[PDB]
JSON list of C-alpha atoms in Angstrom, two decimals:
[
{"chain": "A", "resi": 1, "resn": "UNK", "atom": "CA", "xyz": [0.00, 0.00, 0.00]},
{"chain": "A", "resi": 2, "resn": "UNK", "atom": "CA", "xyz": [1.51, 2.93, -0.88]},
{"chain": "A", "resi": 3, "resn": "UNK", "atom": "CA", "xyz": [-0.39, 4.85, 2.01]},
{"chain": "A", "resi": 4, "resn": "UNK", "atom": "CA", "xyz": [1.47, 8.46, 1.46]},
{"chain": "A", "resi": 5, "resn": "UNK", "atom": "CA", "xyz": [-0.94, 8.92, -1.33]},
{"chain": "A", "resi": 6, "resn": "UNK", "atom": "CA", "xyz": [0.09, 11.09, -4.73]},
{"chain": "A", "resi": 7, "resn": "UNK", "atom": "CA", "xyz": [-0.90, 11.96, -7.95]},
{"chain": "A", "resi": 8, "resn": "UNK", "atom": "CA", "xyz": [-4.73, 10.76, -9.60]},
{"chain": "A", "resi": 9, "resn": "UNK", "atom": "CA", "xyz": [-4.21, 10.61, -13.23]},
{"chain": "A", "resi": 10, "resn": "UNK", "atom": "CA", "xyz": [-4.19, 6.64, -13.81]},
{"chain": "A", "resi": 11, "resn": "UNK", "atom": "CA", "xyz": [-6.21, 4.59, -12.31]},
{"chain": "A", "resi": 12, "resn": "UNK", "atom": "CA", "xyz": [-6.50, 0.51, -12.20]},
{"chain": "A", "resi": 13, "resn": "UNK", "atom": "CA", "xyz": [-9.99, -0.88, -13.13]},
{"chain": "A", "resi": 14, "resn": "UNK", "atom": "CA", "xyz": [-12.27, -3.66, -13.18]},
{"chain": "A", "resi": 15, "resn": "UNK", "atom": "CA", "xyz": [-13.81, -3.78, -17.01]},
{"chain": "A", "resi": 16, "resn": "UNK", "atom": "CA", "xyz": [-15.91, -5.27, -19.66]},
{"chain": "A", "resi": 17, "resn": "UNK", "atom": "CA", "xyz": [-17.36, -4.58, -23.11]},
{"chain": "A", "resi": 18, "resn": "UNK", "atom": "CA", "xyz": [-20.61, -3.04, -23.46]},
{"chain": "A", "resi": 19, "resn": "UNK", "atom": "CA", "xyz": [-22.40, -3.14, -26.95]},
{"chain": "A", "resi": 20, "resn": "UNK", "atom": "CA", "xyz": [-19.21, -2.11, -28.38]},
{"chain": "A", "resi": 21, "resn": "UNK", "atom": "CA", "xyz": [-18.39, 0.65, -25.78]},
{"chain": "A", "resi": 22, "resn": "UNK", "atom": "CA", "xyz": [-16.24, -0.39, -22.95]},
{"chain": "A", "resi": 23, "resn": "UNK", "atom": "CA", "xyz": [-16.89, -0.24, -19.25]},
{"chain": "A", "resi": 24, "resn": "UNK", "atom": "CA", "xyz": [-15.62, -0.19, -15.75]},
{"chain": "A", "resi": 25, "resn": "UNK", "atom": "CA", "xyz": [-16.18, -0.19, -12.36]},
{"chain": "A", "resi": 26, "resn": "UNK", "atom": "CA", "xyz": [-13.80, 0.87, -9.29]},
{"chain": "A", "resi": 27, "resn": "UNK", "atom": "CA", "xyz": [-12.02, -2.53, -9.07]},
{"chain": "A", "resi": 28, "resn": "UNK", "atom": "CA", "xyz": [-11.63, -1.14, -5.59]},
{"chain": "A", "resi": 29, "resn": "UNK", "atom": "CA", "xyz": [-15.22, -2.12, -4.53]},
{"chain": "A", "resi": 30, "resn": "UNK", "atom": "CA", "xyz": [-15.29, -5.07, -7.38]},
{"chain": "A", "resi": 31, "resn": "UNK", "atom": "CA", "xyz": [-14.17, -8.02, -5.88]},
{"chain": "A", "resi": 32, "resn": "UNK", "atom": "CA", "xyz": [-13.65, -10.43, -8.97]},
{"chain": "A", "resi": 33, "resn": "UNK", "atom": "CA", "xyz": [-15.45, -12.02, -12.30]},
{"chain": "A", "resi": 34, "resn": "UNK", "atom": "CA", "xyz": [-17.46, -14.54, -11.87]},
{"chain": "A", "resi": 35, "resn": "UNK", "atom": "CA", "xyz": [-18.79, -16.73, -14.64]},
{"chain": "A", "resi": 36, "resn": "UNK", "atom": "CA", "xyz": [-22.52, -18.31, -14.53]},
{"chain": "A", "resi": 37, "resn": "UNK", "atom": "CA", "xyz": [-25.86, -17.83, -16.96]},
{"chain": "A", "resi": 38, "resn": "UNK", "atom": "CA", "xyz": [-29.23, -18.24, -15.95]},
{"chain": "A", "resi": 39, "resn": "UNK", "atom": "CA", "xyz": [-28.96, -17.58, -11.96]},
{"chain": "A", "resi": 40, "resn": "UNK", "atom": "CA", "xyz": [-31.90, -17.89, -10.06]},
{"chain": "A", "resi": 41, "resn": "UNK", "atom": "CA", "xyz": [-34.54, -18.78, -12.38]},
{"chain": "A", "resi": 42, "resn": "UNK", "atom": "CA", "xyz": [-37.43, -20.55, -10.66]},
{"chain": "A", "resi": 43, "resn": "UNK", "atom": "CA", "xyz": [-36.78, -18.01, -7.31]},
{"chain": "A", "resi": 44, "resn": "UNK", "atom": "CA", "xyz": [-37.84, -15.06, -9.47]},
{"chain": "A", "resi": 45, "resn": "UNK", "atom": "CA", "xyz": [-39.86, -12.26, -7.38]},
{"chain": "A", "resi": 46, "resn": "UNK", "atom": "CA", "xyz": [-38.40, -9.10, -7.83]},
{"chain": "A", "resi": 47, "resn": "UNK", "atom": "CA", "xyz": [-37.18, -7.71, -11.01]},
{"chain": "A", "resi": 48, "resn": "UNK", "atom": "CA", "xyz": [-34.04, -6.07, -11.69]},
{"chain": "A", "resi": 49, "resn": "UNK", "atom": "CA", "xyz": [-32.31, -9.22, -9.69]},
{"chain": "A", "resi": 50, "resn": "UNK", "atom": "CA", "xyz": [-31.59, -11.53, -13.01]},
{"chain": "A", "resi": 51, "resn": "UNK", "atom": "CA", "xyz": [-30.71, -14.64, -10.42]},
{"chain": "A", "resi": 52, "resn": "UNK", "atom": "CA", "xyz": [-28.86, -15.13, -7.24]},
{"chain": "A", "resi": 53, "resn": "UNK", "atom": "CA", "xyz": [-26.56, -17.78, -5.12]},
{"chain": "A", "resi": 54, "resn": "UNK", "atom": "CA", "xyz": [-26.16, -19.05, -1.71]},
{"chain": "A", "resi": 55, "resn": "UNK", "atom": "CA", "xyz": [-22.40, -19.55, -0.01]},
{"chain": "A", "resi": 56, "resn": "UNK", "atom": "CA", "xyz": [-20.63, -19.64, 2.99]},
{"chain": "A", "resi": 57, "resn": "UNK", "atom": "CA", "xyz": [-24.02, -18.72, 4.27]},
{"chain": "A", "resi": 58, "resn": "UNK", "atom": "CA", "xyz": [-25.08, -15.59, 2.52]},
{"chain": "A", "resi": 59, "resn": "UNK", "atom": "CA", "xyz": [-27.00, -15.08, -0.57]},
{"chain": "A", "resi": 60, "resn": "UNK", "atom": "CA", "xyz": [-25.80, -13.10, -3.22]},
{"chain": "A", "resi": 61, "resn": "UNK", "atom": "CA", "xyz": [-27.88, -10.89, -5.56]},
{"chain": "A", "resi": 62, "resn": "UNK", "atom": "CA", "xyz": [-26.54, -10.50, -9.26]},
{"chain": "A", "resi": 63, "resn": "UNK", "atom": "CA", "xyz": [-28.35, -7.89, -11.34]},
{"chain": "A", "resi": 64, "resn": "UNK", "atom": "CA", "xyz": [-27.31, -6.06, -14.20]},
{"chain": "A", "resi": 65, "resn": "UNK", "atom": "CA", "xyz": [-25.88, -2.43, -13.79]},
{"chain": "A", "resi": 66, "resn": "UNK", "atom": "CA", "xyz": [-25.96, -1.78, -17.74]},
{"chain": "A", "resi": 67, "resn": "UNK", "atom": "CA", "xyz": [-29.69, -2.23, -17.01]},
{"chain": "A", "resi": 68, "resn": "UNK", "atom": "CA", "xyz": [-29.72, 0.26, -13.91]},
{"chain": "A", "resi": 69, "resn": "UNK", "atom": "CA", "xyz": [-27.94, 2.63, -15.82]},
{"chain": "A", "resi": 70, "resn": "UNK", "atom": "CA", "xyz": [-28.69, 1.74, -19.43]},
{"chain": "A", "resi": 71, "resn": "UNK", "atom": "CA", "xyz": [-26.00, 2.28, -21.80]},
{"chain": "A", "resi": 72, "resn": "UNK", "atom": "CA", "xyz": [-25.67, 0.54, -25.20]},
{"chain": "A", "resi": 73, "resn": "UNK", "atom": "CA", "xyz": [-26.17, -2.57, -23.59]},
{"chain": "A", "resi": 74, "resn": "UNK", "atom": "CA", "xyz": [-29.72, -4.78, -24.44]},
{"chain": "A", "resi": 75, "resn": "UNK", "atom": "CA", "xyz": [-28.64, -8.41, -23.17]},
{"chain": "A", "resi": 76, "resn": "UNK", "atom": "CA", "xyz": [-27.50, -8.34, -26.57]},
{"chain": "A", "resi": 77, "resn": "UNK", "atom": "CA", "xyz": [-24.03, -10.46, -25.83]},
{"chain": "A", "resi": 78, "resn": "UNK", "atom": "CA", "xyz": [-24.34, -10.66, -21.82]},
{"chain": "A", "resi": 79, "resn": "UNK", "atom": "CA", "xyz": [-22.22, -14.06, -21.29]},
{"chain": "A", "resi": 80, "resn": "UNK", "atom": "CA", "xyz": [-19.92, -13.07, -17.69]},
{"chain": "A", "resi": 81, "resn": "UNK", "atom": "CA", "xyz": [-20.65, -12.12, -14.14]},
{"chain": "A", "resi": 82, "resn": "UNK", "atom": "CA", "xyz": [-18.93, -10.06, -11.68]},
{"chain": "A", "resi": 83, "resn": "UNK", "atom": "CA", "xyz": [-19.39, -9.46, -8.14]},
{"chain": "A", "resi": 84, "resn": "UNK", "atom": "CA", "xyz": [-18.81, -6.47, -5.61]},
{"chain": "A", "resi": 85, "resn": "UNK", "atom": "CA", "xyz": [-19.12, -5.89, -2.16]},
{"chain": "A", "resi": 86, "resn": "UNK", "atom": "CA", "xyz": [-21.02, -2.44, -1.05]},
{"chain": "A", "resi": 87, "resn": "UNK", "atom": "CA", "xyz": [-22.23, -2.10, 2.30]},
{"chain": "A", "resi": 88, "resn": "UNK", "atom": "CA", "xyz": [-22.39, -5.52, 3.11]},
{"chain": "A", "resi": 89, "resn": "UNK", "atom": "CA", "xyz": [-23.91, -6.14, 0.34]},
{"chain": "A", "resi": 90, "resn": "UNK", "atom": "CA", "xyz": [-22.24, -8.76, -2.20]},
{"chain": "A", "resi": 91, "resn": "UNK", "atom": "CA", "xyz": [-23.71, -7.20, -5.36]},
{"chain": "A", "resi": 92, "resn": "UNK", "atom": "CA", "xyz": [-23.33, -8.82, -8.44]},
{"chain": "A", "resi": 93, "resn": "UNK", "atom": "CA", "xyz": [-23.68, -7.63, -12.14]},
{"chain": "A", "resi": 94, "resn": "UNK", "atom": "CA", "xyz": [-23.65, -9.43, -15.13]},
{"chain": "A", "resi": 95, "resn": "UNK", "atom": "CA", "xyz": [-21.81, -8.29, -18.89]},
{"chain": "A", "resi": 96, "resn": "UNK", "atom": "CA", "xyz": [-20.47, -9.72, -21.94]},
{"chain": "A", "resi": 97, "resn": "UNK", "atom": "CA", "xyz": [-16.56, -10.03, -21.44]},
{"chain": "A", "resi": 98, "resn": "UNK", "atom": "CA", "xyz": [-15.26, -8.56, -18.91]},
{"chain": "A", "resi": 99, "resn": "UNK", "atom": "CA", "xyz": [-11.53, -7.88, -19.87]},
{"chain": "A", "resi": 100, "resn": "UNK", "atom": "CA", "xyz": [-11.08, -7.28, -16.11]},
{"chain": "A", "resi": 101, "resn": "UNK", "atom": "CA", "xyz": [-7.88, -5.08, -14.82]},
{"chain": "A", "resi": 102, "resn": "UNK", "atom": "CA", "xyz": [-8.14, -2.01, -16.96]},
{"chain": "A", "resi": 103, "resn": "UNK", "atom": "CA", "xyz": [-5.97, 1.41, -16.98]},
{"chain": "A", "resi": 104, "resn": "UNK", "atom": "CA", "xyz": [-8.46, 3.95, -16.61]},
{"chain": "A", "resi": 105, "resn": "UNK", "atom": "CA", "xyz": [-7.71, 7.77, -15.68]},
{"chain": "A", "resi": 106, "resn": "UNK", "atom": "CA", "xyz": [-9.56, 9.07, -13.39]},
{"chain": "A", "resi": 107, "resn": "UNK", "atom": "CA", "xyz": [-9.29, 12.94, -13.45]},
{"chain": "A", "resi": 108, "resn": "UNK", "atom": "CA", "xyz": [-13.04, 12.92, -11.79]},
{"chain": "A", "resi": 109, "resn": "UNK", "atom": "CA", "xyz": [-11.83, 12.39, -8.35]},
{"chain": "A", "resi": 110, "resn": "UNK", "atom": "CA", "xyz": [-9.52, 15.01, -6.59]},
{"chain": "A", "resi": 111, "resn": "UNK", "atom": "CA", "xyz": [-10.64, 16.75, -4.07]},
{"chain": "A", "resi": 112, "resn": "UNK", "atom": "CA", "xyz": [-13.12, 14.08, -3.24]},
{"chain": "A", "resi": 113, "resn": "UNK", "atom": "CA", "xyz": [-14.61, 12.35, -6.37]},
{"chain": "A", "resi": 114, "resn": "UNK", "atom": "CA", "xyz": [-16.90, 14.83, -8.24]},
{"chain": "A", "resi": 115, "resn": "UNK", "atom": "CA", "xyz": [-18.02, 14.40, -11.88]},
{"chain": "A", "resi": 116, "resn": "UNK", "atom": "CA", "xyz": [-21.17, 14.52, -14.29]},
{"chain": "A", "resi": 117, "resn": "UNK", "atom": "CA", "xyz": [-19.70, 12.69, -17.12]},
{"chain": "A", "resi": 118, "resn": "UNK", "atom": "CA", "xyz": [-22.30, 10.14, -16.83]},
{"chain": "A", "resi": 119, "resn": "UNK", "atom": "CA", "xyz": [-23.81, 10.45, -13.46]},
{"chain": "A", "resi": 120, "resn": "UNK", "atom": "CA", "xyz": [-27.69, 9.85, -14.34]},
{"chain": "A", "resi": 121, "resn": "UNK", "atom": "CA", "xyz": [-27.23, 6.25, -12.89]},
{"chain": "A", "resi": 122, "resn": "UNK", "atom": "CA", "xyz": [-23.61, 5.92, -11.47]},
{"chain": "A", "resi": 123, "resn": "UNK", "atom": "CA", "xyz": [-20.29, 8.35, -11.20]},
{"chain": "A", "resi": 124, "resn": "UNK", "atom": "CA", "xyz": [-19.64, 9.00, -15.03]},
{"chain": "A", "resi": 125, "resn": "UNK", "atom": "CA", "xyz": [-18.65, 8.45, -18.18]},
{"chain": "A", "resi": 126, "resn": "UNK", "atom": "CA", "xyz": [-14.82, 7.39, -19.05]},
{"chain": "A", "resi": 127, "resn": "UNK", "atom": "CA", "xyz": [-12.38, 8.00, -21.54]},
{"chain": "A", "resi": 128, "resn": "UNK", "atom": "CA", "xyz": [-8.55, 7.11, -22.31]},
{"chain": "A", "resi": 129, "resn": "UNK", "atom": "CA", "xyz": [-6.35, 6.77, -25.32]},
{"chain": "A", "resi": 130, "resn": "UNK", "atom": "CA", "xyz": [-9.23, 8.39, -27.95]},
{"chain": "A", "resi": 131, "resn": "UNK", "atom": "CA", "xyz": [-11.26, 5.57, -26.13]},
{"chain": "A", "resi": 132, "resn": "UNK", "atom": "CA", "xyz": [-14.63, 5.34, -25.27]},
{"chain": "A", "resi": 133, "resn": "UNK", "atom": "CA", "xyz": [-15.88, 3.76, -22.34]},
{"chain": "A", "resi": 134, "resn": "UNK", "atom": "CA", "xyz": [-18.44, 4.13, -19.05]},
{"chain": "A", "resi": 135, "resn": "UNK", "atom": "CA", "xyz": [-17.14, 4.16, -15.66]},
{"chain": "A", "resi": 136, "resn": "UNK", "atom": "CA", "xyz": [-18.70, 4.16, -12.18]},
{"chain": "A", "resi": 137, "resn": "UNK", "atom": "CA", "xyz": [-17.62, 3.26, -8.47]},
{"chain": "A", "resi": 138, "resn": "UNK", "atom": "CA", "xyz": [-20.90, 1.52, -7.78]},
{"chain": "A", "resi": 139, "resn": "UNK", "atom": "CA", "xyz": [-22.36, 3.97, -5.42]},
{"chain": "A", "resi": 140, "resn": "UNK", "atom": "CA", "xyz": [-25.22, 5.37, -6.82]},
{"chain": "A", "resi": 141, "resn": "UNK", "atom": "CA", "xyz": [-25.85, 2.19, -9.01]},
{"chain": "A", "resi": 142, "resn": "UNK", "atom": "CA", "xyz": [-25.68, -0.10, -5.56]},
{"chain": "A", "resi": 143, "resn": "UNK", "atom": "CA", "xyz": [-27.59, 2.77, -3.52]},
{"chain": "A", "resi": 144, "resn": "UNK", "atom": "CA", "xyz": [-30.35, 2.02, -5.91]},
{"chain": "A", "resi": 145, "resn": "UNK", "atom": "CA", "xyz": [-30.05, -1.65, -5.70]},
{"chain": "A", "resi": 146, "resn": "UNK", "atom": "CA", "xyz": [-31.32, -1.90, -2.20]},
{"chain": "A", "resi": 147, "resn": "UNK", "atom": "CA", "xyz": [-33.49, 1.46, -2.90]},
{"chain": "A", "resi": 148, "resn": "UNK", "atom": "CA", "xyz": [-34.63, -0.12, -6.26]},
{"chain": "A", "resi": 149, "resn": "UNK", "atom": "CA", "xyz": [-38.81, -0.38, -4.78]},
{"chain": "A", "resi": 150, "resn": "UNK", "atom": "CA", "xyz": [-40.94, 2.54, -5.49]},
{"chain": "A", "resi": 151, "resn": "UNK", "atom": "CA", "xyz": [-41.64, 2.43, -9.00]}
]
């Protein structure tokens, strides 16, 4: 750990591809990829939950963000899974191929993490190298997760 802190131009990422734009999410919160299809089906209930899991005691919900939020993205070639922890809440949201550690710049936080690039679902949108691509540290997208009911 470097600890001292310096310098926010680079960043490390978890990411995926998204209906031909790319997209990440703060690796920091994203624990790892996981890959499954068809979670969940007969427990259906809610809505925005595609399928869960139970392990070491604790059930896991695994929805899809690119749904929350929107983006290119259809469930058009959805195929991976990844997970997250927020709040103690093991969050889960499935994509297409998630390329997983990715170099993304991060000139949105500085003074403490302030951006509308893309924030109508999530921090904002992300670009790098002429490179197009969404990026969000799960906060508002998880906030909604367990806020999701009101309709």
């Amino acid at each position: 750990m470097k600890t001292l802190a310096d310098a926010l131009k680079e960043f490390e990422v978890l990411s995926f591809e998204i209906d031909e734009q790319a997209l990440a999410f703060d690796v920091d919160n994203i624990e790892m990829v996981i890959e499954k299809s068809d979670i969940t089906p007969v427990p259906k209930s809610r809505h925005f939950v595609e399928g869960v899991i139970n392990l070491r005691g604790r059930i896991i919900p695994v929805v899809n963000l690119a749904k929350i939020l929107g983006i290119s993205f259809d469930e058009q070639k959805m195929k991976s899974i990844i997970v997250a922890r927020t709040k103690d809440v093991e969050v889960g949201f499935l994509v297409d191929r998630v390329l997983g550690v990715l170099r993304i710049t991060e000139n949105q936080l500085d003074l403490t993490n302030v951006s509308d690039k893309f924030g109508k679902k999530s921090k904002g949108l992300v670009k790098t190298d002429g490179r197009l691509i969404i990026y969000l540290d799960i906060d508002k997208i998880i906030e909604e997760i367990t806020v999701k009911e009101g309709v």
